Design a protein around this ligand. Structure first.
Ligand SMILES: NC(=O)c1ccc[n+]([C@@H]2O[C@H](COP(=O)([O-])OP(=O)(O)OC[C@H]3O[C@@H](n4cnc5c(N)ncnc54)[C@H](OP(=O)(O)O)[C@@H]3O)[C@@H](O)[C@H]2O)c1
Length: 288
């Protein structure tokens, strides 16, 4: 039904963007999922489990697999939110319009829900943003935003834009809690999506943290479920990645418990401002 396009009767919550679009608060990330079957299966399994939001990017090389999983699921496309991103090499007005068309074609879609500037770089994000504004005017995209932007990048963009970014997708997990950027984005009504919400694997050690383990035990949930619920209760969109059917299902089962104020505080206090992923200041491979 059309109401499913607006995520009205469903188990998951949404965050509302400044243009009144409702964005599902939990999605499936697909970075490092191989194109073809691995991605298609992950996406299909996520949709079967109840997910209605997939996060991909041109540079993940698996937009084909994402669209294949959506089609294989049989769920009407209007009920699913798809995010993708313009890569560094495609920044600049005309290159961004072209990159969008390529992504839309690979995905097999008539429109994309959210299109993001993937990394700021230094010199082309303003012109890139103008292309996103054009795509939005043309109704090719339902929402437009950025990723890995710091307050200084956003302030610079604000001086030139007609439509302010609706989303900023940034690294955010219990060791790197982005307090300053979150304050800035709250002030200016820019929704935050957390990438590497689980720390991007075992190296970072988040899922073995003792505090998370104790909270998990109290709720008979897993540490991953606790982290995802912490994201939810902070009003953050979260896009945990798994290619494993069981873990995909586990990460969705977060709507039937609540963390207390004290549990939320305990997780907040894990912050070390320890960045696990790439730094917006110097990560811009592939610029042209
Ligand atoms: N905008 C950007 O610049 C940017 C950058 C990085 C990431 N992202 C997006 O954010 C998404 C999420 O971040 P991420 O992929 O870096 O990592 P993540 O979601 O923080 O962690 C994924 C890792 O955790 C494992 N895992 C997932 N669920 C689990 C569970 N319940 N129990 C135990 N282990 C679990 C996964 O293994 P299995 O797959 O084997 O389950 C994988 O090794 C990406 O996929 C991508 O969509 C965006």
């Amino acid at each position: 039904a059309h109401h499913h396009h607006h995520h009205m009767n469903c188990n998951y919550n949404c965050v509302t963007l400044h243009n009144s679009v409702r964005m599902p608060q939990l999605g499936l990330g697909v970075w490092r999922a191989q194109d073809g079957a691995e991605t298609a299966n992950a996406v299909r399994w996520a949709i079967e489990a109840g997910y209605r939001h997939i996060d991909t990017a041109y540079i993940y090389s698996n937009e084909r697999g994402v669209g294949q999983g959506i089609r294989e699921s049989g769920v009407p496309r209007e009920e699913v939110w798809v995010t993708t991103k313009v890569w560094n090499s495609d920044q600049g007005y005309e290159k961004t319009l072209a990159a969008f068309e390529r992504s839309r074609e690979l995905l097999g879609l008539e429109y994309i829900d959210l299109y993001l500037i993937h990394w700021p770089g230094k010199k082309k994000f303003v012109d890139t943003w103008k292309a996103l504004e054009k795509l939005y005017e043309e109704k090719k995209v339902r929402a437009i935003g950025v990723s890995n932007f710091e307050p200084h990048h956003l302030t610079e963009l604000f001086k030139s834009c007609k439509i302010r970014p609706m989303v900023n997708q940034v690294e955010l997990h219990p060791l790197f809690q982005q307090r300053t950027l979150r304050e800035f984005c709250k002030q200016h009504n820019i929704a935050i999506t957390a990438w590497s919400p689980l720390g991007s694997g075992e190296e970072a050690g988040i899922l073995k943290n003792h505090v998370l383990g104790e909270i998990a035990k109290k709720h008979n949930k897993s540490p991953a479920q606790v982290v995802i619920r912490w994201d939810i209760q902070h009003g953050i969109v979260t896009i945990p990645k798994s290619t494993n059917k069981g873990r995909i299902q586990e990460n969705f089962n977060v709507w039937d418990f609540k963390l207390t104020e004290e549990e939320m505080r305990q997780i907040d206090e894990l912050n070390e401002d320890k960045r696990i992923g790439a730094d917006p200041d110097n990560f811009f491979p592939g610029g042209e």
